[PDB]
Amino acid sequence: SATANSMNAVKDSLQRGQSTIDVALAAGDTITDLLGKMKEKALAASDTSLNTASF
């Protein structure tokens, strides 16, 4: 019975881990969007027909 009761703490820990990963995935959506925009910036800047102000 004591062994069965201690599984409540195990469940609490696993749910805490799922919450931590949820916050990391929410940050990762922001980071992958930012990286796609930065790739578009570097791709546009590699063109040599731009003037200095656009670069």
């Binding site: 910036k41 546009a44 102000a53 656009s54």
Partner: protein, 54 residues
């Protein structure tokens, strides 16, 4: 919890997804109204500035 009456985590996620759809709809309305995909410095600052100077 799994059968909770105090917390509806599924409703929170559904609210987030509805907010995403509403933000996309607001963006498309701005494009239809101005006729511009880059209508302000908030859309794309570098291309907006280049177009202003040109």
């Amino acid at each position: 919890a799994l059968n909770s009456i105090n917390t509806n985590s599924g409703a929170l996620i559904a609210l987030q997804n509805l907010n995403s759809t509403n933000a996309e709809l607001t963006q498309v309305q701005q494009r239809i109204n101005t006729g511009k995909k880059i209508g302000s410095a908030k859309d794309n600052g570098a291309i907006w500035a280049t177009a202003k100077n040109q």
